[PDB]
Amino acid sequence: RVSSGRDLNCVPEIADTLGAVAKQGFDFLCMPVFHPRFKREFIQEPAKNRPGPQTRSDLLLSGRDWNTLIVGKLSPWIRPDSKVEKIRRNSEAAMLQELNFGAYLGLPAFLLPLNQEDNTNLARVLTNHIHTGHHSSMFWMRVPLVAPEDLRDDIIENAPTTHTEEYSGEEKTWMWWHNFRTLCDYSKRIAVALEIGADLPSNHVIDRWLGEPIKAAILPTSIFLTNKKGFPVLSKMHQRLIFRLLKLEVQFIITGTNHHSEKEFCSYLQYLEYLSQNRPPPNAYELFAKGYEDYLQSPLQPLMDNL
């Protein structure tokens, strides 16, 4: 099947949330390990002495459930690249704490954002965490195809947008990614989770992206169009992109809210299934090669040794 997951940042209770998510047909849930709004300090006397538990215990779930069903998210308030020294230090400490907790829970993957151009300090902290102890939690960097600054509407009088083609300006997000993985030295534990967004960039940009190690694809519920029957659907370009991604065996993560309230949230997932099926079935060559893709093997030398 097509591995699909749900992205939630408000999880009042894990048990019922997971029950509902499984009922809708999703395979995994992306949630925050710590409460998103629960800021924490580590260098201020009144704050650092905060009593009580810092987060819900891991006893709520079986060890198996943690290792397969859940995907951790980094808290939004953490900005390791802030210009303020105090905020930067607090963000570093909080991010380290969250990553350590994720390792303690043995989460299969951890989702971190790349919403801004500069990510040097974040890369340094993540690399330091990787080279510390032994753990197998993969890291997914959430990188929009189109930068947020370019997707904003032309509402500001004094800061109007521009309709210039900006052929070199459509690749900026990729640059953000390319630098980051360069800082972490092409670590095999870092992967991309690109966000489709409402509008696609030039086809060359998508072709370039498809060469990167994409593990997940974030689909906001706001990009789905409404058909005459009121169900969610995707545009032709979105459908082609989804086909190409499916050819890569990526994990789809539906995020957002049920805009088509008249229908059920599962209606979104069902549509992906409809796209999963009906796609061009693999040819004889593709079926033959299945299981040996991007797998390096030395060439044969029949002259020297016998087959």
């Binding site: 033959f288 090669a289 040996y292 093997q297 030395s298 060439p299 044969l300």
Partner: peptide, 6 residues
């Protein structure tokens, strides 16, 4: 190893 590889 399949194809022409090892």
């Amino acid at each position: 190893g399949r194809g022409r590889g090892r």
